[PDB]
């Protein structure tokens, strides 16, 4: 129960929002790497 | 060490036209699958969905699409990890089946077990491998699931 | 005669109406009346049962009668004045035996010589030392049972001091109110901090004691 | 509401029977009684909804 | 000594390096990781890794999140989701981000919304710490 | 002596209210540092705080009645 | 005797206000470590700290009233 | 003197109830901060709460026995 | 009796400053064990430490005004 | 005087049981916090709690001995 | 009476240093566990320990100012 | 004057043991909660609890020697 | 009166060692819980426990100077 853990929120999620914020942070240069990491082209095959 | 009397999941690529990666996992998930209670399976990649589908049309929990053809990332790892959590399937003792690369001459479809329970980790001597909360535990249990996921994915 | 004689009947009767009214609510009516009053024992069967059993149904209602009797006896000591100084005190002494007997019913009745053999064999009392068991039998019952009289007398003291300090504050500043209203405003809030808390803790003693009864029963 | 009124009456009687208070004793207690009322009636209405619904359900 | 493995997906910063101590912003709060280690698990918050490398030299990072893994071993594993040397972050931007964060919060109105925004605030602010 | 030392005996009996006052600070402090761990505010931790401040001022009502016995 | 031991009876009654002073620090100090775990400042913990400051300074009010009783 | 000192001696042993009333504030405090760690609320911790408040009120009931002996 | 008891009556009210003495050590001590968890030192925590030290020297502003009343 | 000061001295020694009472709560409270951290309840930690109640009641039996010597 | 009550009343004000001495063990103890979580030894933590002990022994120097004003 | 004041001198000197008994509960509690975090129990830490229960009783033998001085 | 008030006044000043007694158990208690968090025992931490037992026995040495001033 952190604002997020009491938002339920995954620590992953939390974390990822952090990471997302890292990407948000940084500098242009290093923003390249943002996209390098991140994301998912995956699809939840719900079955 | 962790245990349970009880997330069997395998890791494959989205596509074939590569080795017997698929075959392995396909095999070895099923190879398991009889043994355990809470039989439920998760497939990351689909060259496992495409072979482990026969009746895994019924025993998958979710399945994940794209893997390769887009290089894996932590980012991603988190994604698949995340929703994975939300689901009442956790450990039947989870296991993760992936292709451990070793060399271009060899990989071994490897597997590890995923203790998807904090709880027995709460139990055991694991009790004092931490000496600090079934909270953060979970948020590591979490994190390590992503880390491994990433890892696995990449291997 | 009449004054003491009217007070104890009043005491009894206030617990009797709830204790009669709820038995009655088991089919009729309810209109306003029965359902309204059923809230009384629904508040008992809601509030006190959140702690009780616990010790188990067997005895639960035996204590809950005393718990309600204590709180109802205090409530009958709570708007009658003069009444808190007398009727709640006479009832605190009339509740004094019940508090003693509550450990008696299963503790001292089954083992007087070592009711800590029923209450706490190893704990506070040293199980290696039957002497300290019998000694702390006072600290867990004989004195706690005296402290339960004091615990209702603690409510009586705190309720009384509100009155007295009121009494003395409105006697000191008989201005109508006026500046005594400031202290008397405090003395009012003091009613909650003293009586309403200690009154609580008084029935909490009956809760725990009789918990310790039927928890070992 | 009717219960509350009965309890107040009983109270006043015990005062009257015993030696009249120092005026203060009564003032504080009666005020202490008053304070609960304003909250209490809001609670008292609410009480009704809970149980009669839980009764009705079973 | 402690063998510090400090890594992120991206790189390994320290790899079982005999660093004396590392100060981390676990979600526990701060924490001064010393030469051998408790069996303890810790969660990382957005704050700094200051890696007191057994040589006086200490490297700084801000880490967003991840885990430090506190072994019975003298092996310490910071697995930072990302922990970056502040080097690659920019203060000006930080401000801008924080502003936004703070701007956003105000309309963050599901707990989660608030929370994430708050992550941003908290985070962005926490960059400002050392930026 | 008789109508004197009882006035200085009610002063020493009011020193027993240094445990009912410093016991409330220890009780209603750990239920503030414990609720910081969260999220058992109602029904559990603060409910036990009512039973924590019941055995704290119980030594104080027993110390306020000891001074009241040396006055009235 | 009547005027003497009433002066030495109010002084020892002022020593009962040593529990409220150390109770005030142990109740507003656990909330100084509660917000250190964060973030319920002006929400739950700081609201209960006032309900913890009142329960401890009341045992200082019930002791200063004994000190004022043996003074007027 | 012979009648004076018993009154001054009963209050002095009533100051020994300041240790029992704060020792109950520490035992019930560390149980309120011992239940936040979870989860065995019933048994173990709060069952030893009365077992820790028995040896700490044992110093009060012995002290209030030395205060009552100088009164009766 | 009148002037004699005014000397051993402000001396017993001077031992009431022991609550404010250790209460300031419990308040400022928790702030030293709070900013160690970091990092809201400037404002939030040390600003609240000035609210806790004033509410602990408040009992010190009521106990030192008692002994200064029995003096002159 | 001689049969008087023995009653205004045996009572002041019962104020030495304030450390034995608040020492029993602190030694048991941290035992209730130590067994909340788990798991060696049966011996090792609660066994040492007996070795902490003894070295804390020893400064309460030596203080009760001096009070009993000035009364009998 | 005018010189006798000045020797036994300067002794009761020496019990006000019981707060400055127990409070100093709380202002330094909560600094020992503070630097244990580390790392700001010089500055921040130990600097806040000096501003805390100064506000702990201040109730010891003012209490020894009311002690020496009764004997000198 | 001579035979009486020595009985009301070893009585107030027994109120110095109120720290040796509570401080031993503080050190043996911190060794009870300290060994919970593990693992240096049969060395290092419980060998520091003997060095703590002695320094606490060091003001409990220095205070006890003064109460044995005023009596015999 | 001249030999009486200096014999009962030297006893009241011995209640200033109750602060240094429990103040020594806390500074040696937080060093037991601090070295439990490990590992800078020799130097830094256990070298500060001497700096914490010296500032606590300084009020003890200040209180033992007062009781020896009315005794010799």
Author numbering:
A (entry chain I): 1 to 47
B (entry chain G): 56 to 61, 67 to 96, 101 to 219
C (entry chain W): 10 to 226
D (entry chain T): 1 to 58
E (entry chain H): 15 to 145
F (entry chain L), G (entry chain M), H (entry chain K), I (entry chain N), J (entry chain J), K (entry chain O), ...: 2 to 73
Cite, word for word, the article reporting this structure.
In the mitochondria of eukaryotes, adenosine triphosphate (ATP) is produced by the ATP synthase, a ∼600 kDa membrane protein complex composed of a soluble catalytic F1 region and a membrane-inserted FO region. In addition to the rotor, the F1 and FO regions are linked by a peripheral stalk composed of subunits OSCP, d, F6, and the hydrophilic portion of subunit b. The proton motive force, established by the electron transport chain during cellular respiration, drives protons across the FO region through the interface between the a subunit and the c8-ring, inducing rotation of the rotor.
3D classification of the images resulted in seven distinct maps of the enzyme, each showing the complex in a different conformation. Initial 3D classification produced three classes, each of which appear to show a ∼120° rotation of the central rotor within the F1 region of the complex (blue arrows), similar to what was seen previously with the S. cerevisiae V-ATPase. The state 1a to 1b transition reveals a bending of the peripheral stalk towards the top of the F1 region near the OSCP and F6 subunits. Figures 3A and B compare the fitting for state 1a and state 1b, illustrating the accuracy with which α-helical segments could be resolved in the maps of different sub-states. Fitting of all available atomic models into the density map is shown for state 1a (A) and state 1b (B). State 1a is also shown in a different orientation and without the density map (C) and with the c8-ring removed for clarity (D). (B) Surface rendering of a map (State 1a) shows the bent FO region with a tubular feature that extends from the rotor-distal portion to the c8-ring (orange arrow). The largest change between the sub-states of each state can be approximated by rotations of the α3β3 hexamer relative to the rest of the complex by angles ranging from 10 to 16°.
